[PDB]
Ligand binder design. Structure first.
Ligand code: LYS
Lengths: 291, 291
């Protein structure tokens, strides 16, 4: 039911690295007016890793407040500890977020059965719609289609963000399920295809800088208009590629700065996009008529 | 510079998950008696990611209490947040820890420059000897040899735990460092090889169950006695392989329990060793002469 273009929104920061509230505000508002269907707050793109547990709440809150029940808001609440994921998700519900996006425990390489217990534990512990999130490159673990299918049986595990970028594997996953649980693309570059094949939307990085263009791509692809999907997406294909020239959200945060929407702030270990990539990015934003 | 067998000690747990403090005390004591040269408290093998920050400090404190200055104690204090890492390293220092082990930020894929700035910051904020820790398979990031050689310039970055298991890569690491910082194997299977090549020690998982064996293996290898190193290590070579049949620390914990040294406790997402593996493990243990 949460469908379409879901922006994994960045957490804007001041030069000193403090959360720039106002700029955030302008973003949420801007997204809600440009077409964006929903927002993921404090996810990878929103630097969940470098924000204190209180900044998580405060940031999730500001966004829910500004949204004003207009679009659903999803809170990033994954962690590699189960007790702690349960806490974050609970706080997400209590803040009245519509859903929680939980990445697979990273770094500790839990087994498939563990991933199963992990997610089942959280689902039983909190009464909120949960979305699984697989992105092996970052986590060290790969939630198997099989396991995901196993979890689809739990009534409040309602979806999964597949960031593999592996299309065949994604179609297999969509078919293996039924509307048992939704599938969301996590790979901007292949998202249009995943959606043409059944995926219910795209938790996008690109949406941070091309919300209207991405809204239109998702609507059209979910509708199965392959021709128009390839064409609307083509006008922003390069972006998907170059917004990853360095680890997300590094490039997207600079792109935004090059749009006067946010400030250079970004927390270590992350760093401001390297000089070397800046012009190629400015160029990318022009070629695509973004600025 | 710490040399020898450095055990990545497990954090003993009671059935319900609480830290088994009595067992921990005895393990530490057993290690010093068996020949263990140093202990890494709350590292990966010690379930650092599922322990409370307070449990984290308490474990460090306890181990330093029991060791009673007889061996140096290394505290794992890595985090994917620079602020968080500094906080945790400051605490370890204040707790009396001889040095800290910091895994590269995981999940958020910082850049090489980012890894450099990350470690430089922690080094400048805390005056405690620091040891870098690279294990790409778990972190999603790979601290290159070039970056390690840069960080080796910094006065209090004394060493690097190389868990790649890529010996030729380790040969290049050690040759390029020109002694600026020590190198430790983070891969039990190849550890004796890295040491013969120049590595100062092994931050070992196997030492958890074969402390005296790994202790003489380390001494001999560091002494550059290639035949004694090979034949001593051969005795417990199957152990190095089977302690990873499932993600560490799942296997080692079960090993200790079969040795009747600890209870079955282990926190989620981690799970107790899958049934099918428990028998082959006991056989490995029996064959090795541990039971
Ligand atoms: N990198 C891991 C390997 C364990 C997982 C192998 N199945 C460690 O030694 O901490």
């Amino acid at each position: 039911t949460i469908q379409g273009s879901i922006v994994a929104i960045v957490t804007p920061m001041l030069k000193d690295g403090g959360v720039d509230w106002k700029s955030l505000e302008k973003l949420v508002e801007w997204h809600i007016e440009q077409g964006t269907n929903s927002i993921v707050a404090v996810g990878t793109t929103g630097e969940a890793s470098t924000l204190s547990m209180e900044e998580h709440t405060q940031v999730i809150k500001e966004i829910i407040r500004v949204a004003n029940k207009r679009i659903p808001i999803i809170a990033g609440t994954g962690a590699n500890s189960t007790r702690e994921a349960i806490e974050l998700t609970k706080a997400a519900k209590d803040l009245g977020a519509d859903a929680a996006l939980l990445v697979t425990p990273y770094y500790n390489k839990p087994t498939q059965e563990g991933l199963y217990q992990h997610y089942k534990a959280i689902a039983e512990a909190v009464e909120l719609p949960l979305i699984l999130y697989n992105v092996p490159g970052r986590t060290g673990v790969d939630l198997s289609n099989d396991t995901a299918v196993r979890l689809a049986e739990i009534p409040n595990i309602v979806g999964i963000k597949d960031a593999t970028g592996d299309v065949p594997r994604g179609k297999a996953l969509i078919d293996a399920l039924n509307g048992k649980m939704a599938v969301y693309s996590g790979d901007d570059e292949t998202a249009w295809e995943l959606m043409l094949l059944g995926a219910d939307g795209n938790i996008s990085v690109t949406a941070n800088i091309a919300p209207k263009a991405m809204s239109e791509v998702c609507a059209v692809a979910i509708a199965k208009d392959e021709q128009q999907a390839k064409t609307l997406n083509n006008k922003i294909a390069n972006l998907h590629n170059i917004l990853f020239c360095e680890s997300n959200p590094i490039p997207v945060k600079w792109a935004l700065h090059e749009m006067g929407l946010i400030d250079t702030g970004i927390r270590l270990p992350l760093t401001p996009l390297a000089e070397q990539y800046r012009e190629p990015l400015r160029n990318a934003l022009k070629d695509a008529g973004i600025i």
